[PDB]
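Consortium newsletter contribution from the modelling node. Members have asked for a concrete example of what our holo predictions look like. Here is one, prepared for the manganese (II) ion complex that several groups have been discussing at recent meetings.
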Amino acid sequence: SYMVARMQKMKAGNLGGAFKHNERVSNKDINPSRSHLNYELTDRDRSVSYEKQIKDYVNENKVSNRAIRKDAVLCDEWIITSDKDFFEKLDEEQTRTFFETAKNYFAENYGESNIAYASVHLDESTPHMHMGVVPFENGKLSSKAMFDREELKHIQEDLPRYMSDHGFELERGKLNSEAKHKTVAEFKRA
DNA sequence: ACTTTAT
DNA sequence: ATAAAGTATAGTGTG
Ligand SMILES: [Mn+2]
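And here is the predicted structure:
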């Protein structure tokens, strides 16, 4: 099976929808009886929005005096998953351990306190995690600095290896893959 | 590399 | 006027 890891940039304007989705605050593929099986791997407070948690953290820690820009990438939400075959082979403890391990990889490489949320979804087709990583380093908030072309190349190589080194039977995606990302809605059509 | 943003 | 960070990136699956 392939390691699936892929980030989407979240601005203020889409962290609302990310929070509502992830916290399940009635789509064909959500099974509502399974929603209570979901879990959050960070110690974050569930009544506090992603926008508020991240902006407070960045404002309280940033070196510059200038306001966070309105078009700022406040976090990179990584989807961490694999195929169905992969998870069918794992019990509950193992499944949890898989996401905790992936969370660890981003914590150890990008900063423990940058993992704003790690929301594991079992109530959809395949187990996966939405993991918000704040691109905050050296007192600066910059997805441009943290996730650039070489860094995404490095993660596609080194993350699947790290996961494999930690117990999990997963291979990296195809090096130089020509695939174009489809949205969930676009992938469903196909 | 070029453009937007907040000084 | 300035300069940091905005723009995609790399990967596969029914996020
Ligand atoms: Mn989900």
